[PDB]
């Protein structure tokens, strides 16, 4: 009945690697796009389906290359995913915001023939790394039809967004560039009390934990993807009554869980 849902009920362990569809990647040049510094999509092959967009932003001086398992992880669970390159490795949070707004952009109007048959460019998320959790921030609260925001041990000078776009914040317990005390924690609870949010903390985890293989943040961004791009309940699951011994804090408002 619900016409956006993808693949097989999920397992938490079908979580933890690459799902039920095949991945190709398509290069945006730099020079072929302006607003961004172009990128990487993953995007679902073997299917005749179309699939929920998400772009997103790699951290202060990093590349797409950052996030290549995470952008191949998300397609293969049924995601349209650009990775972007920024216009210069020291663009700032609201910089980077920008270069999600143009990516967005990208996706829905000038994306090859092969990335658009497999959009739904009605349902459109943001996720993103340090300063490029940062603008997944700016841009939730900029564009309200965001369907769902995911920062990744996030960095911001500004600790205050206005969004109703469902936020899950991903913090690492031991983060010495963005320590959750000032960054994650602050940006989750000065989140509107009315906006669906999860705060998770990786135990023991760097600031580089979103930059390789994590099957925490694999199973709680392609859960919060699929519960609010799709609109697939089935993902609550794994975002409620959650007993997780990765994590060493949890909060939300349960917003999300019915
Ligand atoms: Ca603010």
Not at 89 to 109: C, E, I, K, V
């Amino acid at each position: 009945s619900n016409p956006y849902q993808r693949g097989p009920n999920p397992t938490r362990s079908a979580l933890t690697a690459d799902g039920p569809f095949s991945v190709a990647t398509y290069t945006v040049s730099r020079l072929s796009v302006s607003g961004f510094g172009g990128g990487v999509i993953y995007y679902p092959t073997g299917t005749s389906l179309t699939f929920g967009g998400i772009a997103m932003s790699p951290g202060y001086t990093a590349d797409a290359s950052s996030l290549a398992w995470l952008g191949r992880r998300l397609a293969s669970h049924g995601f349209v995913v650009l990775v972007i390159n920024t216009n210069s490795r020291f663009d700032g949070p609201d910089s980077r915001a920008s270069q999600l707004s143009a990516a967005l952009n990208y996706l829905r109007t000038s994306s090859p023939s092969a990335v658009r048959a497999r959009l739904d460019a009605n349902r459109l998320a943001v996720a993103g790394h340090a300063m490029g959790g940062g603008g997944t921030l700016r841009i939730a609260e900029q564009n309200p039809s965001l369907k769902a925001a995911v920062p990744l041990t996030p960095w911001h000078t500004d600790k205050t967004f206005n969004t109703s776009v469902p936020v899950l914040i991903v913090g690492a317990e031991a983060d010495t560039v963005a320590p959750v005390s000032q960054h994650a924690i602050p940006f989750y609870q000065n989140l509107p009390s009315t906006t669906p949010k999860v705060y998770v903390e990786l135990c023991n985890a760097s600031h580089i934990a979103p930059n390789s293989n994590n099957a925490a943040i694999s199973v709680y961004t392609i859960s919060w993807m699929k519960l609010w791009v799709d609109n697939d309940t089935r993902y609550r699951q794994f975002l409620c009554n959650v007993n997780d011994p990765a994590l060493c804090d949890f909060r939300t408002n349960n917003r999300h869980c019915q």
